[PDB]
Amino acid sequence: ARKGILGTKLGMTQVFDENNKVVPVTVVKAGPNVVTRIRTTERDGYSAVQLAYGEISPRKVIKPVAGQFAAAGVNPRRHVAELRLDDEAAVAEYEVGQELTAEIFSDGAYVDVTGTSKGKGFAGTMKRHGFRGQGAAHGAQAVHRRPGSIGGCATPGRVFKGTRMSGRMGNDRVTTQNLKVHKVDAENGVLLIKGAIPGRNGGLVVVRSAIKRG
Amino acid sequence: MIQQESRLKVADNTGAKEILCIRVLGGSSRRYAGIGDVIVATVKDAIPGGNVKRGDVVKAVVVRTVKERRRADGSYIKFDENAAVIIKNDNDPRGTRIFGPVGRELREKKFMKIVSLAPEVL
Amino acid sequence: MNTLDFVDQASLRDDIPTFSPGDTVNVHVKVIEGSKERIQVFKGVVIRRQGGGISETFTVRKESYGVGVERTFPVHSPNIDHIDVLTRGDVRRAKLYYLRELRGKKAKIKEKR
Amino acid sequence: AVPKRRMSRANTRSRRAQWKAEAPGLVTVSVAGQQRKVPRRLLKAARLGLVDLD
Amino acid sequence: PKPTKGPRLGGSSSHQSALLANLATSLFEHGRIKTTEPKARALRPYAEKLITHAKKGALHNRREVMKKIRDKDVVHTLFAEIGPFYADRNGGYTRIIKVENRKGDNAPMAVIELVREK
RNA sequence: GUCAGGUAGAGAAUACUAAGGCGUACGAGUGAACUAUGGUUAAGGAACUCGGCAAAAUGCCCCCGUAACUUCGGGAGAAG
RNA sequence: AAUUCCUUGUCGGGUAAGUUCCGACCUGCACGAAUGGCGUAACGACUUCUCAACUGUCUCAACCAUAGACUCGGCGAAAU
RNA sequence: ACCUCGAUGUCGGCUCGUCGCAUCCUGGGGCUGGAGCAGGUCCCAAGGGUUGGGCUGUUCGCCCAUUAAAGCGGCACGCGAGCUGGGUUUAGAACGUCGUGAGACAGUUCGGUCUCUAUCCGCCGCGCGCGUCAGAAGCUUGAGGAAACCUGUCCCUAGUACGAGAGGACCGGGACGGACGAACCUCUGGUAUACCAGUUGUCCCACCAGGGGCACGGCUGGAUAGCCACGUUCGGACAGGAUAACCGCUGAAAGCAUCUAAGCGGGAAACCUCUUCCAAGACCAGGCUUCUCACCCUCUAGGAGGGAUAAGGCCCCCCGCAGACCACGGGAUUGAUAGACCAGACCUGGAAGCCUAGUAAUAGGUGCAGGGAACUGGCACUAACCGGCCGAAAACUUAC
Ligand SMILES: [Mg+2]
Ligand SMILES: [Mg+2]
Ligand SMILES: [Mg+2]
Ligand SMILES: [Mg+2]
Ligand SMILES: [Mg+2]
Ligand SMILES: [Mg+2]
Ligand SMILES: [Mg+2]
Ligand SMILES: [Mg+2]
Ligand SMILES: [Mg+2]
Ligand SMILES: [Mg+2]
Ligand SMILES: [Mg+2]
Ligand SMILES: [Mg+2]
Ligand SMILES: [Mg+2]
Ligand SMILES: [Mg+2]
Ligand SMILES: [Mg+2]
Ligand SMILES: [Mg+2]
Ligand SMILES: [Mg+2]
Ligand SMILES: [Mg+2]
Ligand SMILES: [Mg+2]
Ligand SMILES: [Mg+2]
Ligand SMILES: [Mg+2]
Ligand SMILES: [Mg+2]
Ligand SMILES: [Mg+2]
Ligand SMILES: [Mg+2]
Ligand SMILES: [Mg+2]
Ligand SMILES: [Mg+2]
Ligand SMILES: [Mg+2]
Ligand SMILES: [Mg+2]
Ligand SMILES: [Mg+2]
Ligand SMILES: [Mg+2]
Ligand SMILES: [Mg+2]
Ligand SMILES: [Mg+2]
Ligand SMILES: [Mg+2]
Ligand SMILES: [Mg+2]
Ligand SMILES: [Mg+2]
Ligand SMILES: [Mg+2]
Ligand SMILES: [Mg+2]
Ligand SMILES: [Mg+2]
Ligand SMILES: [Mg+2]
Ligand SMILES: [Mg+2]
Ligand SMILES: [Mg+2]
Ligand SMILES: [Mg+2]
Ligand SMILES: [Mg+2]
Ligand SMILES: [Mg+2]
Ligand SMILES: [Mg+2]
Ligand SMILES: [Mg+2]
Ligand SMILES: [Mg+2]
Ligand SMILES: [Mg+2]
Ligand SMILES: [Mg+2]
Ligand SMILES: [Mg+2]
Ligand SMILES: [Mg+2]
Ligand SMILES: [Mg+2]
Ligand SMILES: [Mg+2]
Ligand SMILES: [Mg+2]
Ligand SMILES: [Mg+2]
Ligand SMILES: [Mg+2]
Ligand SMILES: [Mg+2]
Ligand SMILES: [Mg+2]
Ligand SMILES: [Mg+2]
Ligand SMILES: [Mg+2]
Ligand SMILES: [Mg+2]
Ligand SMILES: [Mg+2]
Ligand SMILES: [Mg+2]
Ligand SMILES: [Mg+2]
Ligand SMILES: [Mg+2]
Ligand SMILES: [Mg+2]
Ligand SMILES: [Mg+2]
Ligand SMILES: [Mg+2]
Ligand SMILES: [Mg+2]
Ligand SMILES: [Mg+2]
Ligand SMILES: [Mg+2]
Ligand SMILES: [Mg+2]
Ligand SMILES: [Mg+2]
Ligand SMILES: [Mg+2]
Ligand SMILES: [Mg+2]
Ligand SMILES: [Mg+2]
Ligand SMILES: [Mg+2]
Ligand SMILES: [Mg+2]
Ligand SMILES: [Mg+2]
Ligand SMILES: [Mg+2]
Ligand SMILES: [Mg+2]
Ligand SMILES: [Mg+2]
C-alpha cells in the first residue's frame, strides 16, 4: 500500500531527460534497511514498521541498544526510525528481520522527502519572516533594520501571542512534497530526486511514497 | 527584467528610438518583465518623420533583455541592451522591419509575425 | 568518490569531444514545432564550464548585430546533435564573467595557434 | 526603561543563586617519582614531561 | 588552511598577518614558547606550511620563505638545521600543550614547540 | 611665540621615512541578532521620500574650442 | 506674487499623470512707488522646478573586515 | 465636563499586524421588463487576497495604466521607551490686513535639539531543577496547539444549441501562466581580506636581480568552498461527514392542498477530518521490548542516616554545514574527529635560474610551468590518555 525507506544525502546534481531536457537531481543514498520491529494494533494500539540503518562498531553502540538489536535478530545500526502503515494488509508482508533496498520504488512515481533543515543561526526579523527594511537614509536614527511597532496601546495592551518576530530558524524537521524520482538502481541502493530537498551533505533524509497524488 | 521607470531600446522602424517603460503587465503586483511579456511603454524621442510622436502611450513587448533567462534546456540569455517591440491590440507590430536578433520565447508566446520577420531567430 | 558514478554510467553519453572556455562552437537544437521535428544552428562562444560527473555543464554565447546572444547546454545533452568546436580559443580566465561589459570590438576572443 | 518597584528578597536571591561555579575532577600522574595532580587535559603532557606545574 | 571562523584573532587581516609572522619567527628562532592557546591553534597551520616549504630546499623556496617571514637569520637556520632534520617525517611538526591559566586575565595559555623526539 | 630633514611633489596639503618619542594603564575568545564605522553588488536608475537628505560621480597639468546676457571687468576652469 | 480665503482660478509649456514650477489673463477679499516700485551684469553653505551622468535612496536586499553586543577573568556605576 | 494640568506626546508617512461583516472578487442559491452572452437586485458566506505611480505635509481627492478586486470600519482618528519632523506647535524675519502705538491674524512664505543601558507582565527562541513509584536506552500512539487555504489565459466539445441578423451558450476536460510560501547551491549570478596576477609612490633586505612593509585590502582584473537570490524544484487538493441559503418525496391536522410537525434527502473557498510541523509538564503525566535485578555499616530493631556497585550518565579532548552561553551531533588506539603529507579536481595563467636574439626597454626555450583555504581518498607523523566523578524496589486490599 504505502512504501517508504530511509536515505542519506551526499550531493546534488543534474541528469538528462528522455524528452531531451535537463533536470537537477538530488543525490540520495538509500542504503540497505532492515526491519527491526513490527507493530500490531491488538498488542500495541496501531500498525507500523520500525527500521534501522547505518554501520556502527559493536562497542560504540549503547549496551541496551545492542541488546535490543540482538533480540531483533540483526546487527547494530546507526540511527533508528519507523514508518507508519494504515492497514494490516501492508503489515502482513513485513516480518522481523526483513531487509529492504531501493528497488521497491518504480520510476515515474512522486515521492515525499523529510529531513532536518540547515542550521541558520539566530537571525533577525527581516531575514527570518521576510519583513521590509526602512530607509537607510532620510534621517534614520539607528532603526535601520529592526522591525518596530507590535500592536495597540492600552487595548489590549499586549503583543498578540503568536506574533511573527525574531528567533532562531532552521534545525527542525521540514518536508518537501511531490518530487520526481528520475532513476533508481539495484546494485548499491542509490535513489535520485529531481529538485532540491532539505537537509545537509552527509545528512539524514527519509523518503516516503507521495500522499498528495498517489 | 523590465520594471517601472525602466529605460529601453527600440528594435522597430516605426520611427521611435527610445522608450520609457510605463507598467509591467500580467497580474496584480506584477513585478518583473521577461522575454515574451507584453508591457506598456511611453516614447521619449522619435524620428522626426516617424509614425509615432513622443509622449504617446503604446503597448510594447520586450524582446532583448540583459539579465539571464533560462530555457527548458538550461539555456541562459545575456543580451547587450534592453529592447522592446511596439505592439498594437491585435498582437501585431506597428513597424514593418526589425533590428537585431530575437529569442525563441516569442514563438511559444504566439507572436508569429515578429519571429518570422526577424533576420535570424536565436 | 562520487558514489553516483555507477548510476551516472547508465545515462552517460559517448563521443564527447574536448572543449575549453573561450572556444568557438555551434550547436544543433532539436525543436518540435507543430508535431514536426527540425534542426536549427546556433553558433557561439563558450564562456563557462562546470562539470558534474554526468553533469558537465557549459554555456555558449554569440554576437549578432552588435548585441550578444546565448544558449546554455550541459555536455551530455541529447538535444545537441553535434558539438562542433570551430577553433580552440585561448582565454586567460577560465570563467568569462567579465565578458558582460565589453562592447563590439572589445568582446573578441583570442584564437590559439 | 527603569524599574518602578523594589524586587523582593525572594526574587533577588532566587535569581542570584543560579550563578555559581562547578568544581572539576583531578588526575594523578606519576612523573619524576612524584604523583602530582593535573586536569585530564594534561595527562599525556604530564607523563611525557611537557607541562609546567609550580 | 581553513580560515579562523569567527571575528579574527588580533582584530584585522594586516594585524594578524604581522602577528603570525612574528610568532612563527620567534618560535622557529627559539624552539619552545608559551602563548595564548587559540593563538597556538591558529599558529599551527603557518609553521606547518613553513616546514612543508623547508622539506624541499631550492631557490624558489628560499624566496617563498623570505617573503613569508622576513628574517635572513631565521630562514637560514630554518633551511639549515630544521629542514633536513624533518626529512623522513610526514606532518605533525608542532606540539600544543596548555599550562596554568594567566593571572592577568585568566586566558588559557598553551606551550607550543617543535617535536624533538627524532 | 621659536626650530621646519629626504623622496614624490606647486607647496607648511597629502603618502612613506631620519633625528626623536610613542603603541596612553582593562584583557582573552566565540562567523548571533542588532547598533555603529566602511567595501563590493546582477540589472533598472529617484519608481521610496517633503527634497537626489545621504550616498554615488567629476576632479591634476598642457593644448584645441566655448553660448544666452552684461554695468564690457565678466559670465568661464562655462559645456566638450 | 514672500501678499489670492473660494483657489488645485481659467488658458499654454514639461512628464503617464504636475494642488509644486514656468509663461500669460486681471475677478488686486487684502500690490504699489524712499516703512520705495519695476528689472538688472556678477555673487550667494539662500528659496523653488526641470535636465545628462552618477549611484543600494529604492525595487529587494545579500555578502564581507572592523568597534560593541556574547562567555570567562579584574574593578565596578544610575535614573526609579 | 466624570477620569488624566506634582505631564494621557499631536496629524501624516515607513515597518508591524489583529478583529467584525453592513462583502470587492473568488463560492452556492431566488426573481426579472434574465432569446444567448452580457446584466440588475436579494440571501448565505470572513477561508484567502485586495495595484503601482504623478500632484500636494497631507487624510481625502483628481489624473495615468492593469488585474479579480484595488472593501468598509474598530483597535488612545492601531502603533514616536520602533523610526521621520513635511504642517499644526515657542524664540527671527517679511509680505497683506487690523491697531496712531507695543502686538496680533485656524492668512501666507525660510530654517528651526524627538532623551531613556528592560524591573515585571506579555512575546519570540534556547537552558538548569524536580515527578511521573527499583534504576536506565530507544521507538512511539496520541488528546491537545500551529502552519497553509490565491488565482488568469488558450484549444476541443461547437460556431453546435439559440438568435432575423449581428452575435454567441451552460457544464467538463487538456495545456500553459502569474502573486505567496517552503526548501536548496546542479545551473547563472552577487560576495569572496592567509588565492593568483598586473600596477603608482615611498621604505627596507650589503649591490643589483628578486622580494616584502605602508598608503580605505594602496588601486584594479579575477576567483575554490561557505552564505545568498535575480537562480532551480515543490505546495495551495482530490475525496469523505454533518451544515447556511435553496430545491424535493409521502404526507395530515383542515376528506383537498402543503419540503415537515413523524420521517427519508440532495446542497458552498464556511465547519470536522484529509496535507505539513509542535506535541505524554496531556498531573488519567500514556504503551513495547532490551540491560544491572543484590554488598554492607550505623543509630536501635519502627524506620531513618552513611558507605561500597552495575547498566547508564557526567566531567574532560578534538571538532561539526550544530551553536550568543548552553543545548544538539561525531570519535577516542580494538581510532581517520581535527592537523599535515601525497595524489586528484579546482582556481590562477607561463614561477626562479640558465641560455639564445636584440645596444636597449623585451621575447623565446627548458614546461599544459610556478603558486594556492573550506572539495575526495590513503597513510597515525602530531593531538584526544598508566581516570576520576554521579548513578539499584517502604508496602498494603480484592479476584484469578
Ligand atoms: Mg526565506
Ligand atoms: Mg529593507
Ligand atoms: Mg545609521
Ligand atoms: Mg612652513
Ligand atoms: Mg607612517
Ligand atoms: Mg620617533
Ligand atoms: Mg549591533
Ligand atoms: Mg551601514
Ligand atoms: Mg564592483
Ligand atoms: Mg539601478
Ligand atoms: Mg530627475
Ligand atoms: Mg513630494
Ligand atoms: Mg550631499
Ligand atoms: Mg551661466
Ligand atoms: Mg567666459
Ligand atoms: Mg567651467
Ligand atoms: Mg501670482
Ligand atoms: Mg502667495
Ligand atoms: Mg514680483
Ligand atoms: Mg494655478
Ligand atoms: Mg512636490
Ligand atoms: Mg488679488
Ligand atoms: Mg492691503
Ligand atoms: Mg514712502
Ligand atoms: Mg511706514
Ligand atoms: Mg527693498
Ligand atoms: Mg520683481
Ligand atoms: Mg531683475
Ligand atoms: Mg547598484
Ligand atoms: Mg525586502
Ligand atoms: Mg572575511
Ligand atoms: Mg573588543
Ligand atoms: Mg560588541
Ligand atoms: Mg558580543
Ligand atoms: Mg564590573
Ligand atoms: Mg469635570
Ligand atoms: Mg479624578
Ligand atoms: Mg512632562
Ligand atoms: Mg503615545
Ligand atoms: Mg502627535
Ligand atoms: Mg451577511
Ligand atoms: Mg455570485
Ligand atoms: Mg439582479
Ligand atoms: Mg466576506
Ligand atoms: Mg483559511
Ligand atoms: Mg507622492
Ligand atoms: Mg482595529
Ligand atoms: Mg494614534
Ligand atoms: Mg491598526
Ligand atoms: Mg486608527
Ligand atoms: Mg526603547
Ligand atoms: Mg517599555
Ligand atoms: Mg510655521
Ligand atoms: Mg511645527
Ligand atoms: Mg517672531
Ligand atoms: Mg498698508
Ligand atoms: Mg489710528
Ligand atoms: Mg510701536
Ligand atoms: Mg535654515
Ligand atoms: Mg523631541
Ligand atoms: Mg538617550
Ligand atoms: Mg529591566
Ligand atoms: Mg489532535
Ligand atoms: Mg554574482
Ligand atoms: Mg556571492
Ligand atoms: Mg588579503
Ligand atoms: Mg629591501
Ligand atoms: Mg609599503
Ligand atoms: Mg584603512
Ligand atoms: Mg584586484
Ligand atoms: Mg551563499
Ligand atoms: Mg397538505
Ligand atoms: Mg405540493
Ligand atoms: Mg509520564
Ligand atoms: Mg556509566
Ligand atoms: Mg557534546
Ligand atoms: Mg577559475
Ligand atoms: Mg617572477
Ligand atoms: Mg588545499
Ligand atoms: Mg575533508
Ligand atoms: Mg563519590
Ligand atoms: Mg515510606
Rg (CA), chain E: 15
A15 touches C: beta carbon within 8 Å: yes
Domain count for chain B: 1
Q: Which of C31, C65, C72 sits opposite B101 (nearest CB)?
A: C65
Count of Cβ atoms closer than 10 Å to residue C55 Cβ: 19
C10 with A185: Cβ contact below 8 A: yes
Ligand located closest to D25 CA = 81
Classify burial at A155, counting beta carbons within 10 Å of its beta carbon; exposed 0-12, middle 13-18, buried 19 or more.
exposed
Q: Are the C-beta atoms of C30 and C79 separated by less than 8 Å?
A: yes
**Secondary structure of residue B115 in the 3-state scheme:** helix
Between chain B and chain C, how many beta carbons pairs sit less than 8 Å apart?
55
Pairing mode of beta strands B7-10, B83-86: parallel
Strand order in the sheet with A99-100: A79-84, A48-53, A33-39, A99-100
**Secondary structure of residue A128 in the 3-state scheme:** helix
A16 with C53: Cβ contact below 8 A: no
At the topology level, CATH places domain E1-118 in 50s Ribosomal Protein L17; Chain: A, (3.90.1030)
- Calculate how close chain C gets to A20, using CA atoms only, in Å: 5
C54 with A190: Cβ contact below 8 A: no
Locate the domains of chain D by residue range. Answer: 1-54
The phi-psi region of residue A129 (left if phi > 0; otherwise alpha if psi is between -120 and 50; otherwise beta) is: alpha
Distance of CA B74 to the CA centre of its chain: 23
Residues surrounding ion ligand 77 at CB below 5 Å: C 94-95
In angstroms, rounded to a whole number, what is the distance separating the alpha carbons of residues A49 and B70? 44
Residue of E96, E95, E91, E117 lying closest to E108 (CA atoms): E96
Q: Residue B33 sits in which domain range?
A: 1-122
Domain count for chain C: 1
In angstroms, rounded to a whole number, what is the distance separating the alpha carbons of residues E80 and E99? 31
Which nucleotide does the CA of E103 lie closest to, via C1'?
A: G73
DSSP sequence for A91-108: HHT--TT-EE-GGGS-TT
* Method used experimentally: cryo-EM
Q: Residue C6 sits in which domain range?
A: 1-113
Pairing mode of beta strands E109-114, E32-36: antiparallel
> What CATH code is carried by the domain that includes residue B14?
2.40.150.20
